C-alpha cells in the first residue's frame, strides 16, 4: 500500500524539472513544502508500471539517507508522486556553487550519509545503477539523501560497462567516484577525457588522482572502491564502518594524501 493524497491537498507552485512523461514541481502539501512528479495523459502501460512501482518502493523504504515519500495521487489525473522537499537541491550543483566553503569533517559527514543510504538499499536488494552526485539531494541540515532523476560511463564499474553486470559492487565503484566528486567540490570525473578515453585509461590501470586537501584515509578508501576485481572492493558495510570511525576520531583526517600539482609556479 501507498498513502493516497487527495488533489485538493496539493498546490503546484513552480516547475523545477522533467519526468519521464510529465514535469517536476515545487509545491505545498496540507502546510509543508514538497516535490511533485507528474505523469500526464497519454502515458503507456510501461510508464504507469514504472511510475507507480517507483512510488511503491519509496513508500516501503524508511531511512534517514533515502528520500521520503509523502504519498501518491493515483485515483485522479495527472498522477503524482509527492516527496519531501530538499531545499539545497542536487549535490553536484550545490558543491560547485559552494566551492571551498565546508570543512573536511563536513564533507566526510556527507559521504557517511550517502554510504549509509546505499548500505540500506543494497541490503534491501536494490541496485541503484546511476549513483552520482547529480542523483543525491541535500537538505538544510546538510543531510544527503539518495534519489534518482533518470550508460553514464564515467561513474560505471567496468563489468557493468562490458557485460551489463549491475550489482551492489558496481554501486560501490560509483560511490568511489562520488567520494572524488565531493572532495573536489563537484569536479567532472576524468575532466575533458572522452568516454572511450576513460574506458581505455581504466582498462590500462589509470585511476583518478588525489583531490586537493584530501585525507589519506579517504583517498585510500576511494581507490579500493575502484578495484578492477569486483570481489576485492569493500562492501557498503565496510565503507560505513570506516567512515564512522574516521569521523569519531577526527584527528585521523588531518593526515593528507600528497597532491600532485599539474602546474608548478617558481618564485
Ligand atoms: C530540488 N529539491 C528537490 N527535493 C526533492 C525532490 C524529489 C524528487 C522526486 C524523486 C523521485 N524519485 C526518486 O527519488 N527515485 C529514487 C528512489 C530511491 C532512492 C528510494 C530508489 C520521485 F519519484 C518523485 C520526486 C518528486 C525530485 C525529482 N526532485 C526533487 N528536488
From Swiss-Prot:
Q: Which residues lie on this side of the membrane: Cytoplasmic?
A: 1-267
Q: Where is this region: Mediates interaction with ARHGEF16 and ELMO2?
A: 3-267
Give the Phosphotyrosine positions (modified residues): 25, 126
Residues forming the catalytic site: 130 (proton acceptor)
Q: Where does ATP bind?
A: 16-24, 37
Effect noted on mutating residue 130 to N: Increases serum-induced chemotaxis. Loss of EFNA1-dependent regulation of cell migration
- Please describe the post-translational modifications of this protein: Autophosphorylates. Phosphorylated on tyrosine upon binding and activation by EFNA1. These phosphorylated residues are critical for recruitment of VAV2 and VAV3 and PI3-kinase p85 subunit which transduce downstream signaling to activate RAC1 GTPase and cell migration.
Q: Where is the Protein kinase domain?
A: 10-247
What positions are modified (Phosphothreonine)?
38
Task: Supply the induction statement.
Answer: Up-regulated by UV irradiation via a TP53-independent, MAPK-dependent mechanism.
Modified residue Phosphoserine is at which positions? 241, 264
What does it do?
A: Receptor tyrosine kinase which binds promiscuously membrane-bound ephrin-A family ligands residing on adjacent cells, leading to contact-dependent bidirectional signaling into neighboring cells. The signaling pathway downstream of the receptor is referred to as forward signaling while the signaling pathway downstream of the ephrin ligand is referred to as reverse signaling. Activated by the ligand ephrin-A1/EFNA1 regulates migration, integrin-mediated adhesion, proliferation and differentiation of cells.
Q: Return the similarity comment.
A: Belongs to the protein kinase superfamily. Tyr protein kinase family. Ephrin receptor subfamily.
What's the protein called, per UniProt? Ephrin type-A receptor 2
- Tell me the gene name: EPHA2
Q: Tell which residues of the whole protein are contained here.
A: 604 to 895 of 976
Amino acid at each position: 500500500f501507498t498513502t493516497e493524497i487527495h488533489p485538493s491537498c496539493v498546490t503546484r507552485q513552480k516547475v523545477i524539472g522533467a519526468g519521464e512523461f510529465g514535469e517536476v514541481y515545487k509545491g505545498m502539501l496540507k502546510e509543508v513544502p514538497v516535490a511533485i512528479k507528474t505523469l500526464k495523459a497519454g502515458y503507456t502501460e510501461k510508464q504507469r508500471v514504472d511510475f507507480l512501482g517507483e512510488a511503491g518502493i519509496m513508500g516501503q523504504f524508511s531511512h534517514h539517507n533515502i528520500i521520503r515519500l509523502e504519498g501518491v495521487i493515483s485515483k485522479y489525473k495527472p498522477m503524482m508522486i509527492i516527496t519531501e522537499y530538499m531545499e539545497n537541491g542536487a549535490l553536484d550543483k550545490f558543491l560547485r556553487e559552494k566551492d571551498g566553503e565546508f570543512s573536511v569533517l563536513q564533507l566526510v559527514g556527507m559521504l557517511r550519509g550517502i554510504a549509509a543510504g546505499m548500505k540500506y538499499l543494497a541490503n534491501m536488494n536494490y541496485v541503484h545503477r546511476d549513483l552520482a552526485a547529480r542523483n543525491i539531494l541535500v537538505n538544510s541540515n546538510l543531510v544527503c539523501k539518495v534519489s534518482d532523476f533518470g550508460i553514464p560511463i564515467r561513474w560505471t564499474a567496468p563489468e557493468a560497462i562490458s557485460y551489463r553486470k549491475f550489482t551492489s559492487a558496481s554501486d560501490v565503484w560509483s560511490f568511489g567516484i562520488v567520494m572524488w566528486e565531493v572532495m573536489t567540490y563537484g569536479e567532472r570525473p576524468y575532466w575533458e577525457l572522452s568516454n572511450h578515453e576513460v574506458m581505455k585509461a581504466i582498462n590500462d590501470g589509470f585511476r583518478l588522482p588525489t583531490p586537493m586537501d584530501c585525507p589519506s584515509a579517504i583517498y585510500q578508501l576511494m581507490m579500493q572502491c575502484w578495484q578492477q576485481e569486483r570481489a576485492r572492493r569493500p562492501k557498503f558495510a565496510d565503507i560505513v564502518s570506516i567512515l564512522d570511525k574516521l569521523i569519531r576520531a577526527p584527528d585521523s583526517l588531518k593526515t593528507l594524501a600528497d597532491f600532485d600539482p599539474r602546474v608548478s609556479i617558481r618564485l
